[PDB]
Enzyme design. Sequence first.
Site, PDB file in Angstrom:
ATOM      1  N   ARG A 188      72.252  49.110  31.235  1.00 22.41           N
ATOM      2  CA  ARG A 188      70.790  49.042  31.123  1.00 22.41           C
ATOM      3  C   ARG A 188      70.090  49.302  32.452  1.00 22.41           C
ATOM      4  O   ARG A 188      70.403  48.695  33.481  1.00 22.41           O
ATOM      5  CB  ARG A 188      70.313  47.691  30.541  1.00 22.41           C
ATOM      6  N   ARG A 210      63.186  52.724  30.029  1.00 23.08           N
ATOM      7  CA  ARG A 210      64.405  51.921  30.006  1.00 23.08           C
ATOM      8  C   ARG A 210      65.403  52.552  29.026  1.00 23.08           C
ATOM      9  O   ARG A 210      64.999  53.148  28.011  1.00 23.08           O
ATOM     10  CB  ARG A 210      64.061  50.496  29.524  1.00 23.08           C
ATOM     11  N   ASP A 261      66.551  48.032  25.255  1.00 24.27           N
ATOM     12  CA  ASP A 261      65.977  46.689  25.260  1.00 24.27           C
ATOM     13  C   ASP A 261      66.334  46.061  23.913  1.00 24.27           C
ATOM     14  O   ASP A 261      66.086  46.679  22.904  1.00 24.27           O
ATOM     15  CB  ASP A 261      64.453  46.735  25.396  1.00 24.27           C
TER      16      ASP A 261
HETATM   17  C1  LIG Z   1      57.507  48.844  27.985  1.00 26.70           C
HETATM   18  C2  LIG Z   1      57.490  48.613  26.502  1.00 26.70           C
HETATM   19  C3  LIG Z   1      56.558  47.449  26.043  1.00 26.70           C
HETATM   20  N1  LIG Z   1      57.003  49.830  25.806  1.00 26.70           N
HETATM   21  C4  LIG Z   1      57.465  50.296  24.573  1.00 26.70           C
HETATM   22  N2  LIG Z   1      56.790  51.209  23.866  1.00 26.70           N
HETATM   23  C5  LIG Z   1      57.320  51.607  22.668  1.00 26.70           C
HETATM   24  N3  LIG Z   1      56.616  52.507  21.922  1.00 26.70           N
HETATM   25  N4  LIG Z   1      58.507  51.141  22.195  1.00 26.70           N
HETATM   26  C6  LIG Z   1      59.232  50.212  22.906  1.00 26.70           C
HETATM   27  O1  LIG Z   1      60.323  49.793  22.514  1.00 26.70           O
HETATM   28  C7  LIG Z   1      58.725  49.692  24.169  1.00 26.70           C
HETATM   29  N5  LIG Z   1      59.353  48.787  24.867  1.00 26.70           N
HETATM   30  C8  LIG Z   1      58.879  48.233  26.064  1.00 26.70           C
HETATM   31  O2  LIG Z   1      59.566  47.421  26.742  1.00 26.70           O
END
Ligand SMILES: CC1(C)Nc2nc(N)[nH]c(=O)c2N=C1O
Lengths: 160, 160
Positions: free
Chosen positions: B83, B92, B95
């Site tokens: 990660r 990233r 998550d």
């Molecule tokens: C940075 C943040 C909030 N933005 C995201 N934005 C989207 N569209 N999908 C995500 O999984 C996601 N995950 C995050 O961690």
Amino acid sequence: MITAYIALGSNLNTPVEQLHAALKAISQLSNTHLVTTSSFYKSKPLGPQDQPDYVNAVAKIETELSPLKLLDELQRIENEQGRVRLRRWGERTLDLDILLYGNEIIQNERLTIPHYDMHNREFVIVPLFEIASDLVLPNSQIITELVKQFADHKMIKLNP
Amino acid sequence: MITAYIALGSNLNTPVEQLHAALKAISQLSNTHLVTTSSFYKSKPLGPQDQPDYVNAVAKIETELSPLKLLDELQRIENEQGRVRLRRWGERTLDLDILLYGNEIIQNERLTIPHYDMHNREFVIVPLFEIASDLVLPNSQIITELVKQFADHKMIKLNP
Ligand SMILES: CC1(C)Nc2nc(N)[nH]c(=O)c2N=C1O
Ligand SMILES: CC1(C)Nc2nc(N)[nH]c(=O)c2N=C1O
């Protein structure tokens, strides 16, 4: 001098009075001028449903205070106003949050500006749109697009 | 066993494969069974717009791991899959977030279940609704209502 946007919310110990007291305190800050404040909106709680509805607003200020000094001052106002929170995601007498600080992006130990989850909150975006109709956010999104999602909101616009 | 829902997101290093690798790792956990997974959705980034679009999904598992032991395993999967996250609110490779753990409400230093801001994300509620249309949240809200706000979403549901 920078234009900043502050989100205010409360659902405990006379919410409307808590917001008026907080706005008065913000208006009295050194090197800061309260430009305008949106209407007060009574909204359904985001979190446990067994708590009172919240009263929300967004204030626009012009300040020469740095981001961390503005934060210090808002926290001082919450402290001197006797801020009480009964549980996480639950009841609180007052919350003051810096939504925007000019067009700056500040993400450090004490600040998260912008805090994007707040752009998904009806009680944040609807009031902001009311006082900044053609605002463009630091991440390049436009307020007119963001408010679309809340076109059918059921918040009550109070008076006063 | 407890029925838990896990949110999955990725916008780097071939997102679709990051999700498949994660789901495989989750399915292989001790005292855990991967029941179903939603479709994968391509969505606009929540945060800075100068990052790739995300690929999102939600998985339903049955486990006997405690909330904190499940968290440790999910973090171990993230670590073992290398990660990487550039900045706050930024890109990233993966998550994994515990959205719900049975009908429990866990709010401590390491966990926030449920995390109410997630109920405001089109990329978590739409896929959650896909696999649990009858879901009644810990605060008694019904998913059939929460999803209405995302009826007009522009997310691209991907094949298979
Ligand atoms: C940075 C943040 C909030 N933005 C995201 N934005 C989207 N569209 N999908 C995500 O999984 C996601 N995950 C995050 O961690
Ligand atoms: C607990 C949480 C997310 N719920 C809220 N819900 C509403 N409607 N308004 C708020 O200001 C507010 N603030 C909070 O801090």
